Every structure is written in structure tokens, then in C-alpha cells.
């Protein structure tokens, strides 16, 4: 199977729905390789939990935690890590306000080679318990032979692009990981890397990151042929006073590039209320009333979470995906799984009369293009050549009584799955 795209295991659904699914313990298992060292890029971490996901025999190998925490939060993370002598930390610079280090990636160095995992889950128990999350698993990349002259590069330029992404951190502990990547053969890679890093990018540099990076790839490696754009995410930034300020101007413009209906998928209150977790699923859907009230126009694009295809309608999404289905939703021109939510912070916004792209955050995703497999389009696998779309198509519009889940207002009129109400404060 050419995609190597997986969902995480969900507790409390029938076993058949977890058969092709992966838990972090599966990923770190000895069947995947004899572990020597690892790097864990993420946003939230529970270190005690994380160490327990490694198999006992690998639990004392060096682990590098790449995080964005500052001040007190940084002090607390160092304190959780201290007991574990084998753990080092790298604080990613966040020079721009309201930026986060949001990338979820594992670099796994083995005796037998190197693996890269790009995924959507925080390193905390609740992200891997009852949520819909996505994982891309690289192949086992072998070491380049001791006396040989090869680039180890793929046709998608994945090796160079990943080194460029790590190089932007300007961090000593990542230079060692960059050197490790240099030494391995990543030529089998069939996905394109799409990254965001904090900065203001001018001229040629605009194409390197965020939605301009996606636009550049779609221009160069997709062919044109009414095909909608679908975006599916778990956090929503401040998008502006109306659809023309960013969403439908620069953002949709990048997404529809090749060589238009826009569907946005985001859980309603009813989706959350009746989920496996109930209202506490909302702790991972942090759309605030302060943001929502500025942009009620956005909610007309909102569609329900529905995932009968993967038995996950009650497993709230923390995966983020973007794609370009045909008018009948039976094929797609491309698919993207990423850490990037629907925000300018993650995707970039144009500044200074459109000569500057400003990005607040670190994000990372992988783009699946038919051309990378010698195809023109992918057929959609109707039941999770054939791409496994993890949710139902076509997406269903919010009903007249539906509202977007907003995490910081109370819900006290109907109890959730576990008989509880939601009263933040």
C-alpha cells in the first residue's frame, strides 16, 4: 500500500474498526526497528506517559523533546523530564506573538535505519484514546553505504525539504538530527513535505512555507482538468470580518490551484455532546466565543463530523486534512494530512501590500499527489490506487439548529454521553 496513512486506535469501538489502526505503542514497538535514539516534536507533552509508551528495552535510549514552551511552562516541562536522565529538550524559538510549536513528528533512529513519522496527536494520553487522529509512516530508510556517492533524495525532494525545515530552528540539538538524515537514503519517499515556520517571508522565500508552499506544489505537480475544496480541522483562528479578507481570497486561492465550492468540516455541539468522550472532547476543540462572534459568516461553510466509513462518527477529530474531490466525491486530485488548523497563524497571511507572508507557528504535513505514483487522480476508498478518506462524503451541512462547538461557553440544557454538563470556569 503506497500511502502509509493510518488512523490511531480508538478505545470503545468494535475491533474491526481498529484492525488497520495504530497506537503509539505499535509505532515504537521492536517490530518497527531496533531503537537507538529518537526525537519527539510536539505541542503538548506528558513525559511520564510518553516514556511508558516506549517498550521497556528502549526506555533508556536518548530522547529529544522539541517543544515551544516558555517561562513557567518551560520550567514545568523540564521538571517532568528531570527524573529521566536520557531525556533532553530543545526549545523552538517562537519570536512571533501567538505562535505555537504545533508540529507533530517523530524521528526514530534504529540500528537498521531511520524512520520519520508525521502525525496529528499531542503526546498525552487523551489524544490517543478516543479521538480521530492521522499518522503518516515513512519507509525504513537505510543508511547510505560507507563508500558510496548518493544524494539519498526522492523525486519529491523530501530529504532536502525536511533538512530545510529542521535548519530553520537554528538549534544545536537538531543539527545532530540533520546530520543523521544526511546519512540516510530517503529516495523511496512518495509524499511532499509541507511545513510552516515562524517568520515574515519575502520574494522567492514565500513559496517555502504555509499555503504558498502548497500553492507552489499544486502548480508544479498537479494537472488541471467545479471540483470542491474540503478542509477539516480542530481549531479555528480569527479569519477576518468577512470571507474576502483571507479565507476566500488568499487561502482558497492557494487550495484551488492546479497546474469553487468550499466545504469546512468542524464538530457541532451535538457531535461533541454525543461522542465517546462527551463534552470533554471539547477540551481539544478550542474555538472561543471571542473569536466566533467576530466571524459568524464563517459558520455557513460548516459541515458536521461524520465518519461511518471508519466507525469514528463518535470519535471526535483532532486530525486535520485538506483535499480536492471531484464534483461527485468519487475521486480526489490530492490529499493533505497535517498539523495545521484553520488559522492564519498556521497557514500564513499576506502583509505589506502582499509582498510578505507572515506565519506565526511551526506546522508540518504530507501531501499525497497522484503524479508521485504515476497517476492522474486517486479513487476514494468508499469504506475505510484507492485513497482511504477517513470521514464520510459528501460532507453534511449543519442543520438550522446546529452550532459550532465553542469550548468556553456553558452547555447545561442536555447531558452528554456520560450524563454530565459543561461549565467552563
Amino acid at each position: 500500500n503506497p500511502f502509509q496513512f493510518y488512523l490511531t486506535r480508538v478505545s470503545g469501538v468494535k475491533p474491526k474498526y481498529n484492525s488497520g489502526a495504530l497506537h503509539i505503542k505499535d509505532i515504537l514497538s521492536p517490530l518497527f526497528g531496533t531503537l537507538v535514539s529518537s526525537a519527539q516534536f510536539n505541542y503538548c507533552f506528558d513525559v511520564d506517559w510518553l516514556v511508558k509508551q516506549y517498550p521497556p528495552e528502549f526506555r533508556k535510549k536518548p530522547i529529544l523533546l522539541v517543544h515551544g514552551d516558555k517561562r513557567e511552562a518551560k520550567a514545568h516541562l523540564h521538571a517532568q523530564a528531570k527524573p529521566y536522565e536520557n531525556i533532553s529538550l530543545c526549545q523552538a524559538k517562537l519570536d512571533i506573538a501567538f505562535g505555537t510549536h504545533h508540529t507533530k513528528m517523530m524521528l526514530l533512529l534504529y540500528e537498521e535505519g531511520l524512520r520519520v513519522v508525521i502525525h496529528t496527536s499531542n503526546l498525552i494520553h487523551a489524544d490517543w484514546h478516543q479521538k480521530t487522529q492521522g499518522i503518516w509512516l515513512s519507509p525504513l530508510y537505510p543508511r547510505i553505504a560507507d563508500g558510496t556517492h548518493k544524494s539519498g533524495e526522492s523525486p519529491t525532494h523530501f530529504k532536502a525539504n525536511l533538512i530545510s525545515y529542521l535548519t530553520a530552528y537554528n538549534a544545536p540539538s537538531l543539527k545532530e538530527w540533520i546530520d543523521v538524515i544526511h546519512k540516510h537514503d530517503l529516495s523511496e519517499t512518495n509524499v511532499y513535505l509541507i511545513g510552516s515556520t515562524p517568520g515574515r517571508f519575502q520574494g522567492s522565500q514565500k513559496d517555502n512555507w504555509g499555503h504558498f508552499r502548497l500553492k507552489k506544489l499544486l502548480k508544479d505537480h498537479a494537472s488541471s482538468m467545479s471540483w470542491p475544496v474540503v478542509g477539516q480541522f480542530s481549531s479555528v483562528g480569527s479569519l477576518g470580518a468577512d470571507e474576502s479578507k483571507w479565507l476566500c481570497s488568499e487561502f482558497k486561492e492557494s487550495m484551488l490551484t492546479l497546474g469553487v465550492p468550499l466545504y469546512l468540516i468542524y464538530p457541532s455541539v451535538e457531535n461533541v455532546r454525543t461522542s465517546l468522550e462527551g463534552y470533554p472532547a471539547g477540551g481539544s476543540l478550542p474555538y472561543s466565543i471571542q473569536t466566533a462572534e467576530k466571524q459568524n459568516w464563517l459558520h455557513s461553510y460548516f459541515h458536521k463530523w461524520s465518519a461511518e466509513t471508519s466507525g469514528r462518527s463518535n470519535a471526535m477529530p483532532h486530525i486535520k486534512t485538506y483535499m480536492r474531490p471531484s464534483p461527485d466525491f468519487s475521486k480526489i486530485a490530492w490529499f493533505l494530512v497535517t498539523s495545521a488548523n484553520l488559522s492564519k497563524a498556521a497557514w500564513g497571511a499576506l502583509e505589506k501590500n502582499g509582498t510578505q507572508l507572515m506565519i506565526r507557528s511551526y506546522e508540518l504535513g504530507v501531501l499525497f499527489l497522484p503524479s508521485a505514483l504515476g497517476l492522474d487522480s486517486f479513487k476514494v476508498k468508499q469504506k475505510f490506487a484507492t485513497f482511504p478518506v477517513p470521514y464520510d462524503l459528501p460532507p453534511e451541512l449543519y442543520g438550522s439548529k446546529d452550532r459550532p462547538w465553542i469550548w468556553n461557553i456553558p452547555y447545561v440544557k442536555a447531558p452528554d454521553t456520560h450524563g454530565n454538563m459543561w461549565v467552563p470556569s
Binding site: 505541542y43 503538548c44 507533552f45 506528558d46 517543544h67 514552551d69 511552562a73 516541562l77 499531542n122 498525552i124 487523551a126 477540551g283 481539544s284 478550542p286
Partner: peptide
């Protein structure tokens, strides 16, 4: 950071 709300 242990989760989104701290």
C-alpha cells in the same frame, strides 16, 4: 504544556 487549557 499538559493540554490546551494549561
Amino acid at each position: 504544556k499538559l493540554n490546551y487549557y494549561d
